[PDB]
Nucleic acid binder design. Structure first.
Lengths: 92, 117, 61
DNA sequence: AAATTGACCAATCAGAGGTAGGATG
DNA sequence: TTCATCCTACCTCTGATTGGTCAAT
């Protein structure tokens, strides 16, 4: 594994940040790097919870339902509810 | 309630702003003609973050797609929450300390205790 | 540092602490800081590229 | 006065997306 | 058996990475 692969690419992260702020706003390099680390931990944190439930149920594939379940388990109930219809429409 | 995280720890006008953003997101997520290829974050990199964990074996295309959307929302709301502190300090530049301050307002962000001391 | 954190998150936080420590060792990461740049070839490109008097890469017509 | 640092520019190359062939459920 | 969709390897084609100067602080 390459070390940069533990994180989402910083340019993409910073671009989403820029859209969330006023046009005159600036973002410190440290803030971009921090955000990059936070959103990457969000993926890994939720994934680990989903992975362990998958292993217990002797399933090899982490699916969308597993992500949603992990989200509510870990106290991201709003993320899970919002992404529920998104998953169902993807599946149809 | 299921939406408590949206306003958790926010005061006054900020509550309305984050609520309205979430409403916008939810409305979009209900849209009938999604393009599941186009995202601000690359699906392959999301998958690679997931695969960094050796406990993860196989991954449905569903999972990075949900994360693509979820992570967009996560970055956006955390950035909006953090900007409050930059404005409070009469600054135009978002600093790391603004993100740390934002995280301190909701226990939803407790998972980042080690990431952002 | 508090004894009790978000009850829904605590056990997974501990598990992630172990995984992050192991991954840092796997990746041979020792210093508490990032490199100045990721890629020698991309650094070289950026160093070689023509710039205007204000240090910007030349505008494309 | 001196130090710090973030936006700006876009071309090259590490890598994202696509998928054939094989495997699995 | 047929269907759905994963894995890896290989191929296109590309968009994230990148730093000298100026200006704000």
């Amino acid at each position: 594994m390459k070390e940069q692969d533990r994180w989402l690419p910083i340019a993409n992260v910073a671009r989403i940040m820029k859209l969330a702020l006023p046009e005159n706003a600036k973002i410190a390099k440290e803030a971009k790097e921090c955000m990059q680390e936070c959103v990457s931990e969000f993926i890994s944190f939720i994934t680990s919870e989903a992975s362990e439930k998958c292993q217990q149920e002797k399933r090899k594939t982490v699916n969308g339902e597993d992500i949603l379940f992990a989200m509510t388990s870990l106290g991201f109930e709003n993320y899970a509810e919002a992404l529920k219809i998104y998953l169902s429409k993807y599946r149809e | 309630g299921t939406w408590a995280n949206v306003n958790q720890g926010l005061q006054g006008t900020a509550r309305d702003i984050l609520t309205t953003y979430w409403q916008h997101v939810i409305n979009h997520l209900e849209s009938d003609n999604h393009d599941y290829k186009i995202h601000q974050l690359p699906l392959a990199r999301i998958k690679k973050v997931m695969k960094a964990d050796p406990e993860v074996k196989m991954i449905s295309a569903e999972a990075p797609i949900l994360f693509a959307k979820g992570c967009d929302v996560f970055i956006t709301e955390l950035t909006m929450r953090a900007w409050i502190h930059a404005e409070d300090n009469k600054r135009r530049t978002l600093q790391r300390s603004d993100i740390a301050a934002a995280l301190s307002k909701s226990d939803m962000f407790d998972f980042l205790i080690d990431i952002v001391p | 540092s508090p004894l009790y954190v978000n009850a829904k998150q605590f056990h997974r936080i501990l598990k992630r602490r172990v995984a992050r420590q192991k991954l840092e060792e796997q990746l041979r990461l020792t210093s508490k800081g990032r490199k100045p740049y990721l890629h020698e070839s991309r650094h070289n490109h950026a160093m070689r590229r023509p710039r205007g008097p204000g240090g910007r890469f030349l505008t494309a017509d």
